[PDB]
Amino acid sequence: SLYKTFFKRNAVFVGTIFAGAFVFQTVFDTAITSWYENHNKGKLWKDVKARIAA
Amino acid sequence: DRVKDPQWLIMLGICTHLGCVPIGEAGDFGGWFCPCHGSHYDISGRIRKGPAPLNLEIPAYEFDGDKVIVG
């Protein structure tokens, strides 16, 4: 009954779904971009731009 | 049976085996040589050696004086 009033109305249920999906899109985009850049360090173009200093 | 004028050879380039393009002034027979599978072509457009089953087709062309219409 502690969480069921948080699930009782369907309005607050789908509001929770949309708020969490907004937060999930932002966080998941930032995290996958950071991991995909970290896994390929030394190969992306900002690395070569930092190395080629001329 | 292939030319109306023995002075001139006008033949189609659609080869009978695969449609390849023989090389002009090449081969061992004085005519043409298919580079795909060695269909040796004579000076009149016939298969001698190679997997080409038939001879080269002559298009329809008629004389009009100082030219020839092709079709």
């Binding site: 985009d29 996958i32 190969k43 992306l44 173009w45 690395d47 080629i52 | -």
Partner: protein, 248 residues
């Protein structure tokens, strides 16, 4: 066909952009463009690669602008209808060395050099085929092969007889970063550059693939849970049958 008409099978070289997470080596793309411009671009067009795609990928903004302003393109004509030229800009395409097909076939003994915008995606084997093609010329053909004059041998080309010359020799170019520019180094660099030219979306394609595979795997497992949940009233359903009174 024999193995000669089919061509020898290019082996599995371990590229730095194979695998579902590795991206291109952009320094290798920069050096591949340098080897392209100083070796290939005498005889190969690159008609589908605009200048703006190199900005932020293999060169900076001013580098692409000062490489494009060395070339002349067709401007709109002046106030008397006379045709005039202009220096290049970022929106134009990389020009070929030959104005038409017949000049190409004239300058290359009849053979037409194919446009290299999609050549690593239009050959079976791909990267391995292009690398083995470049570094695969023997010093002399095997005994018993009569080459037509003006043609060259390497076993990776289908048929054995290619109309290209061996155009990768030791240290014919100098690299900007001081990398030792042997034949295999330059061939690896141009094959990476041509992989970029055929697939400029490759980096973003793999990261959006990572996002999509993660989200769809999570959705697939969640949907397995919800199917096992909403069918639980029907999987566990039981039936007993006592046969009815036969008088009715």
């Amino acid at each position: 066909m024999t193995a000669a008409e089919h061509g020898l099978h290019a082996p599995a070289y371990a590229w730095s952009h194979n695998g579902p997470f590795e991206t291109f080596d952009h320094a290798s793309i920069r050096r591949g463009y340098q080897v392209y411009r100083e070796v290939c671009a005498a005889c190969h067009s690159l008609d589908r690669v605009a200048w703006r795609t190199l900005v932020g990928v293999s060169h900076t903004n001013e580098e692409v602008r000062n490489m494009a302003e060395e070339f002349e393109y067709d401007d709109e004509p002046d106030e008397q209808g006379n045709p005039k030229k202009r220096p290049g800009k970022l929106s134009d395409y990389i020009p070929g060395p030959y104005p038409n097909e017949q000049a190409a076939r004239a300058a290359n003994q009849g053979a037409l050099p194919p446009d290299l915008s999609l050549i690593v995606k239009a050959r079976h084997g791909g990267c391995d085929y292009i690398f083995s093609l470049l570094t695969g010329y023997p010093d002399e053909p095997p005994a018993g092969v009569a080459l037509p004059p003006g043609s060259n041998y390497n076993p990776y080309f289908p048929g054995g007889s290619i109309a290209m010359a061996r155009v990768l020799f030791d240290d014919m170019v100098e690299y900007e970063d001081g990398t030792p520019a042997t034949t295999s180094q330059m061939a690896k660099d141009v094959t990476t550059f041509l992989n970029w030219c055929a697939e400029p979306e490759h980096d973003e394609r793999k990261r959006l693939g990572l996002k999509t595979v993660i989200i769809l795997s999570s959705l697939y497992l969640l949907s397995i849970w919800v199917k096992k949940f909403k069918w639980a009233g029907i999987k566990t359903r039981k039936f007993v049958f006592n046969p009815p009174k036969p008088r009715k």
